[PDB]
Design a protein around this ligand. Structure first.
Ligand SMILES: COCCOCC(=O)Nc1cccc(F)c1
Length: 330
């Protein structure tokens, strides 16, 4: 089997991408944030505290003839940005782009933190990291990809995120028309539960490539590119007037600037992030200070190849017995 679904930016900045997902019988379609940096499929629901729902579409398990309470199971996650959610668990039929999993754990939110409430466009998350990070207790549940894998034509999914435009998540096949050149594959460590890999270096604009190992995670659920402070300083030094602002929370730059590209290495291959992809717009409405899309990971504990990086590539998440990642230009 295969599946193929369009993913759409939630706003004009590509802050996140939403993908329609069919849950239950009859289908209830929710728009979920596919998140390779995490492993729970959770939804706003008829159980979510009413004051914490503000425009999201909810899953109502009592209206699904295939929903079953997973007795005794609870979940609770805290994300790197400080947001969180928790609740109980149902199993139900879940379909993405024509690919159907029966008995998928659908984690129903009883509580969500304010950032989720305040974003009416995201009805939940669909985790695509390794199932060892799933938070359901006392019995850990599998991700949608883990449940689908054996049925897929090939045990892979691909992320093709658009810049200011829709893109595609495919399951079970590699669309050879969706990228240019070849796909360069690189080793993955699953030791932390993530799609963790080592970039071979970087360049700023037309500058020379610096060969240096940068371990990080491919995380579709993180907006920005978080890299070591040395790398980030080298990038922003090429933008007149750019500076790190403790009060804003990262590097800002004059909105009148033209940003240089940023290149990262994948083995001997190179993925070029155009400068425009690094512009996240005014820090507040009407400001001439703009927020940068490349930020320091120093306070995180891990480097994160988020959407800013991934949207410049066609990315293969290869879930073979020994997982690997592939990157192609597009
Ligand atoms: C095995 O789960 C133990 C509880 O974990 C809670 C928890 O917040 N986990 C978590 C947070 C962010 C990403 C991710 F993938 C997992």
């Amino acid at each position: 089997s295969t599946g193929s679904a369009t993913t759409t930016p939630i706003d004009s900045l590509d802050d996140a991408y939403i993908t329609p997902v069919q849950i239950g019988t009859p289908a209830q379609t929710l728009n979920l944030d596919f998140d390779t940096g995490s492993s729970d499929l959770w939804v706003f629901s008829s159980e979510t505290t009413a004051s914490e729902v503000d425009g999201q579409t909810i899953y109502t398990p009592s209206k699904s003839t295939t929903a079953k309470l997973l007795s005794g199971a609870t979940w609770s996650i805290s994300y790197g940005d400080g947001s969180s959610s928790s609740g109980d668990v149902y199993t139900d039929t879940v379909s993405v782009g024509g690919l159907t999993v029966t008995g998928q754990a659908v984690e129903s939110a009883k509580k969500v933190s304010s950032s989720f409430t305040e974003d009416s466009t995201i009805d939940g998350l669909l985790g695509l990291a390794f199932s060892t990070l799933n938070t359901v207790s006392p019995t850990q549940q599998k991700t949608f990809f883990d449940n689908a894998k054996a049925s897929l034509d090939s045990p892979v999914f691909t992320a093709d995120l658009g810049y200011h435009a829709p893109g595609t998540y495919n399951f079970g096949f590699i669309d050879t028309t969706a990228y240019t050149g070849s796909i360069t594959y690189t080793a993955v460590s699953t030791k932390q539960g993530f799609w963790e890999w080592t970039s071979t270096g970087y360049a700023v604009g037309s500058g020379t490539f610096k060969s240096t190992s940068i371990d990080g995670i491919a995380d579709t659920g993180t907006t920005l590119l978080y890299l070591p402070a040395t790398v980030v300083s080298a990038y922003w030094a090429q933008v007149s007037g750019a500076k790190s602002s403790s009060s804003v929370g990262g590097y800002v730059f004059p909105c009148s600037a033209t940003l240089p590209s940023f290149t990262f290495g994948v083995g001997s291959a190179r993925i070029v992030i155009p400068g425009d992809y690094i512009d996240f717009g005014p820090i507040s409405t009407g400001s001439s200070s703009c927020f940068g899309g490349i930020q320091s990971s120093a306070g995180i504990g891990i480097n994160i190849f988020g959407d800013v990086a991934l949207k410049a590539a066609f990315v293969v998440f290869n879930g073979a017995t020994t997982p690997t990642l592939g990157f192609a230009s597009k």
